[PDB]
Write a protein that binds this DNA or RNA. Structure first.
Lengths: 459, 155, 476
DNA sequence: TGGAATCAGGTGTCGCACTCTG
DNA sequence: AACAGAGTGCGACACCTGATTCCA
């Protein structure tokens, strides 16, 4: 067993020891515990694990799909990627075999001069049917997808052309349609005996309230994993931290997404105009909306220029209208049979999502989100994308067919496009296509309710 | 064309419409009288009620035409709607030649309003109907837009 | 040793090639000794074929057998030549007399010399066999992506398909009848669908490690700058071919030159361009008379569609003509002939092209006329375009406003620009002042379908592309 | 004045012909 | 009476998107 490059695992261990804010004797015994399991980590780059579970079948498709063409690849990206593919062949997961199917491949540049290969499996995926404590710790799986062996009779689908020769995988391929669900199904009941754990695609999170229980659970989970046959990447994991990142959120002690809404005081005509535009939807179902809204129209009628005089009575009006909208007004019960439709929009400082059923008259539930400084310096598109991510999580949690109404246009373009112009896509569009692959969800653009200028939320 | 310093007066017209709370739209009109430097002499902002933006613009143009008939000396009109001016200038002889009907042989919308525009233009034929749209009239158009919003938001 | 029928004058070939180089006398002596001491590499006989030291390949993957067939009439002229060819093959043992279940026809094909190449028809056999879809043969990408240097060289393999054997149980399909005798192949038979795929896969596998190499089927191309590295890489290639068991012909090969032909395109010190032979062929054409000849002429013209900025607009009436007439007869007019003369004259004034860099961002410049649209490509800091593109507007696109025309041209150019990018950032120069206002464009003004509009707007958020406004060369 | 049924038309899949390179 | 690859075009159906038009 010889790799090509060996990572500085000792330095990462030292960094983890210092980064974890525990007692010094706690640190030393934790270091001893980590050291006693030295074979745990993949000190070799692209080191792959193994599973002894029976191989899975993934060629459940009934109609034969057509092959796809390939285009030339950059000379600069060739050396490193060739070393990677050679190592993968050496691991035995890849073999040289001749098959009917070919899959387009192309590289993308990493932050450094290195390149990363990606495989476009849209054609294949088209025709394959599917089926809180104070102490925190997070572990992750390094290329766990390459742990599930594939049946021999189903190997021919994943072949692709590199250096003029076909190559065939033996484990679950990256970016495949049903692969993440299958991997999650095995990993979740791999630990069905230990409560309090939380697994998502690749990361695994545990929470404890003491130190001894934390040590005991860590030792137990490590033994279970070593029995299973998986390997962990120390670089991307962290533990024993009061704050941690997971599911795109930051976790404090003992949530972030709320239901209060509320708005700070207006200062300009633009803010009041935007607020009126935002609340213009409410007239569809609120009978006494006109009486409450008349003071706002009176205020805008008399006012001139950008100077305004909004007394505390206007504050009482807006607070009352918010309470009336939110408390129990027309909030109907959800329908299981009806497909769920969600409409979302983003503000320069916050965002708002709404849920209906079959285009129902009344909202089902509300959502909100506050932008921290980290994303406050981001592009608007990134803000709206992360809000859409959070909204999709909530919607699938409350799910059944799902529809989304967003200012995004690229989503619907990617969802439906004829074959002759497939070509390639960006580094994040594949991550979102991971959702876009499943036809149970649809995306739409309507250009409704612009909110370029609005007051932020309260403190 | 002759400079603005020769005509008796210039009229600045603008209309806006906004979605309303079982009421579809609320529309206001703003028209200012100027007599020539630039001196916008006086102002009129009027709401209409439940109609689209085009109804507001056409009501504004008849308002301007009737006050121009109240005004002595050839005058000019400027608005934010080039479509109406182009259509009238291109189809007026046909417009009162075919009996106030379109190319589809159907009475086009705003029948009485179009009749008023036509008779006002024909009785006072020395009037200028133009539309420029960054120039001098930008400020006048901005205040007229503000006036139209003020009219629309009145109720 | 080996004794074929016709002995070839190898010394004459070596003298001709060494005399045809641009090297000096000492360099010529070095190359002469290099070629001499690797004398085993080249063929010394007619129909000389090699052998490969690899495990065999099995093509017998079919499930149900087809029905054998018989031979139809044979051309009289080639009969002694084909008989000699078959006898020579028998001498080398490539073809063996043996009766099998299957039988396949024979068909001679004329060759540049008095000889005839051997080709066979496998219709039912190809119908009943699964296909290998490994795509590793794209001529256009190779000719648009190769690196150009001062001293160029190429090598062409000969009789390559005859050097890769087959498994013992899979040979029975290759059976065929000759003069009442049944014969079977030993190696990959030419005319078989998977044979080119296997051959190209093997050949590209050989030359992985050698830097700056372009490989296509039976041809290897490369250019370098100085004599020392060129000789080093050439001798390394010769050694790898020697261990590979392949064989090389002088006549089809040439090395150490300044201008050379490749895939029908002449590469020179300035860049790639057309050859004299194709110019002669196009200059010797006449007025078409039938639909078949018309389609052929237009295909020859379409072959070189990327050597002139304004190709598409002139050829359009000719394309419209074919739909007008029915069957073979075509209604010709003098104006069409005028168009033909104009096209051939424009081709006679064609200019050469350039290569595409892999280290610098690509640039595209686009413009629109009331009837057509023009697209050109460039590298950063360069002035001579890589290739030209032109689009003709259809009847539906005629009603579009000028912004719609510019935008549809934008899409129809970036559709291939994204392919040509090869991961590099893309900068666009257009006569449009801004794009945020384009997003701000209201709906009452536009007329085209919203389905086109959303596709057009999709390009705004691509992180890999940008835009720039420049007021240069306007038209209307 | 506005609102929704019927209907003519653009976009997409798949078929055909021809060329060249080998 | 041949294949693989590439390039371009044209042509007959399918399916839906938008406009015309009648009616409240």
């Amino acid at each position: 067993l010889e790799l090509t490059v060996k990572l500085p695992v000792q330095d990462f261990k030292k960094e983890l020891i210092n980064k974890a804010n525990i007692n010094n004797e706690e640190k030393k015994q934790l270091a001893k515990l980590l050291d006693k399991y030295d074979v745990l980590w993949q000190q070799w780059e692209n080191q792959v694990g193994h599973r002894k579970i029976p191989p899975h079948n993934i060629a459940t498709g009934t109609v034969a799909p057509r092959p796809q063409r390939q285009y030339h690849i950059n000379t600069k990206a060739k050396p490193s990627i060739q070393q990677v593919i050679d190592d993968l062949l050496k691991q035995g997961v890849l073999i040289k075999q001749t098959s009917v199917m070919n899959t387009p491949i192309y590289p993308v540049p990493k932050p450094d001069g290195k390149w990363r290969m990606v495989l476009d499996y849209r054609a294949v995926n088209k025709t394959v049917p599917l089926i809180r404590q104070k102490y925190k710790s997070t572990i992750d799986l390094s290329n766990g997808f390459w742990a599930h062996p594939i049946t021999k009779d189903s190997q021919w689908i994943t072949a692709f052309t590199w250096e003029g020769k076909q190559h065939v995988w033996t484990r679950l391929p990256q970016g495949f349609l049903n692969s993440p669900a299958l991997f999650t199904a095995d990993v979740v009941d791999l630990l069905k005996n230990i409560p309090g754990i939380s697994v998502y695609v690749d990361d695994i999170y545990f929470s404890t309230e003491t130190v001894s229980e934390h040590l005991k659970i860590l030792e137990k989970v490590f033994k279970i994993l070593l029995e299973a046959g998986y390997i962990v990447s120390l670089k991307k994991s962290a533990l024993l931290r009061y704050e941690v990142t997971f599911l795109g959120f930051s976790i404090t002690q003992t949530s972030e997404f709320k239901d209060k809404q509320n708005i700070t005081s207006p200062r300009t005509l633009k803010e009041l105009q935007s607020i009126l535009g935002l609340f213009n939807f409410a007239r569809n179902f609120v009978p006494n909306f006109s009486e409450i809204i008349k003071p706002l129209y009176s205020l805008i009628s008399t006012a001139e220029g950008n100077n305004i005089k909004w007394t505390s009575e206007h504050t009482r009006y807006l607070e009352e209208i918010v309470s009336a909208l939110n408390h129990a007004g027309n909030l109907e019960q959800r329908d299981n049979e009806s497909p769920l439709v969600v409409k979302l929009n983003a503000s320069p400082k916050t965002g708002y999502i709404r849920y209906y059923n079959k285009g129902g008259q009344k909202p089902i539930a509300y959502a909100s989100h506050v932008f921290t400084n980290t994303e406050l310096k981001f592009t608007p598109l990134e803000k709206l994308l992360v809000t859409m991510h959070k909204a999709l999580i909530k919607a699938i949690d409350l799910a059944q067919p799902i529809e989304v109404y967003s200012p995004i246009i690229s989503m619907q373009k990617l969802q439906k496009t004829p074959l002759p112009e497939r070509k390639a896509l960006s580094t994040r569009w594949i991550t979102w296509l991971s959702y876009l692959e499943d036809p149970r969800i649809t995306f739409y653009y309507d250009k409704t309710l612009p909110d370029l200028k609005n007051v932020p939320e309260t403190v | 064309m002759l400079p603005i310093i020769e005509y008796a007066a210039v009229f600045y017209t603008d209309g806006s419409a906004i979605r309303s709370p079982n009421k579809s739209h609320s529309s206001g009109m703003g028209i200012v009288h100027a007599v020539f430097e630039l001196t916008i002499e006086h102002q009129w902002s009027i709401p209409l009620g439940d109609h689209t933006a085009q109804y507001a613009e056409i009501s504004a143009v008849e308002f301007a035409c009737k006050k121009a008939n109240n005004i002595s000396g050839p005058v000019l009109i400027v608005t934010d709607s080039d479509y109406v001016a182009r259509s009238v200038n291109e189809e007026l002889p046909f417009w009162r030649s075919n009996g106030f009907v379109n190319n589809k042989k159907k009475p086009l919308k705003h029948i009485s309003k179009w009749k008023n525009i036509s008779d006002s233009l024909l009785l006072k034929r020395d009037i200028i109907i133009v539309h420029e749209p960054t120039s001098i009239h930008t400020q006048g158009n901005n205040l007229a837009d503000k006036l139209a919003t003020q009219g629309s938001y009145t109720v």
